[model samples]
Target: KVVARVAEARAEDVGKRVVRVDKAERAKVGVKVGDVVEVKKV
Candidate 1:
């Protein structure tokens, strides 16, 4: 499954924050464009 973390402080972007790739190390561990990642773009 896709894994990640907060790259920085994003209180306003609680629902639109970008995920800092923390673990998805596998070659298949990544998100696609318009893939509605559980996270958001801060």
Candidate 2:
């Protein structure tokens, strides 16, 4: 699985908020685009 920090959590982003991962990171983690990932603060 890939791990990343939340750059922003604004309601203004609404439907525009998207998780971005590098192409290599995506391939390494086997996460496809549009995948809904669970978020937990560390």
Candidate 3:
């Protein structure tokens, strides 16, 4: 599992369970591109 912080959201991204990670970070966390769990971005 991944531990992340609550980030700011805007427009249509203001919904629930939102996660944003770049390809590099995604690889860093070994997370799938189409995956959405308990995570965050910085």
Candidate 4:
């Protein structure tokens, strides 16, 4: 499992469902770039 901070975006692609995690974390979680993940609502 992994946890990350949610933040606002200032780039052109704003207001999107995205997650940014460290490379190490990504590898550990076995996800690749552009992979779609299911997020549980808190």
Candidate 5:
């Protein structure tokens, strides 16, 4: 039941979007300042 839809239908310009994931174990997901956030392709 995962819905992935944006209001504006723009696919070419989505490269600049930031993808974030929450810590399910701690119930928090805010990114800290300069905490070395990383993204990898699976």
Candidate 6:
């Protein structure tokens, strides 16, 4: 499969990153676009 961008906003800066899930999942987790939680992979 191929990958494409999601979400509904313009992204700027080289440091932007995000992930998402369904409405049910959103209630359980607090992830969002432009999240400032310092979540990153090393």
lDDT of 5 by residue, 1-42 (tens): 222223543576476454433354123334553344454433
Model 2, residue 32: distance off in Å is 1.0
| Minimal lDDT window, size 10, model 1 | 18-27
Tell me the number of clashing residue pairs for each predicted model: 2, 0, 0, 0, 0, 0
* True-structure RMSD, every candidate: 6.8, 3.5, 4.2, 2.2, 7.6, 7.5
Candidates sorted on TM-score, descending: 4, 3, 2, 6, 1, 5
- On residues 1-42, what C-alpha lDDT tens digit does candidate 2 reach at each position? 466656654676668747667678788777789887665666
Best by TM-score: 4
Which residue pairs of candidate 5 clash?
A: none
- TM values, all candidates: 0.24, 0.43, 0.54, 0.55, 0.23, 0.28
Model 5: per-residue Cα lDDT at residue 13? 48
After superposing candidate 1 on the true structure, give the runs of residues whose Cα lies further than 4 Å from its correct spot.
Answer: 9-30, 40-42
lDDT of 4: 0.72
Clashing pairs for predicted structure model 4, backbone only: none
Reference-based TM-score, model 4: 0.55
Residue 34 local lDDT, model 1: 38
Candidate 3 residue lDDT tens string, 6-37: 55776787775666776877887887877865
lDDT tens per residue, model 6, 1-42: 222345564466335464544555444455554444442344
lDDT of each: 0.48, 0.69, 0.66, 0.72, 0.41, 0.45
Q: Model 3: how far is 7 from its true place, Å?
A: 4.0
Q: Which residue pairs show backbone clashes in model 3? A: none
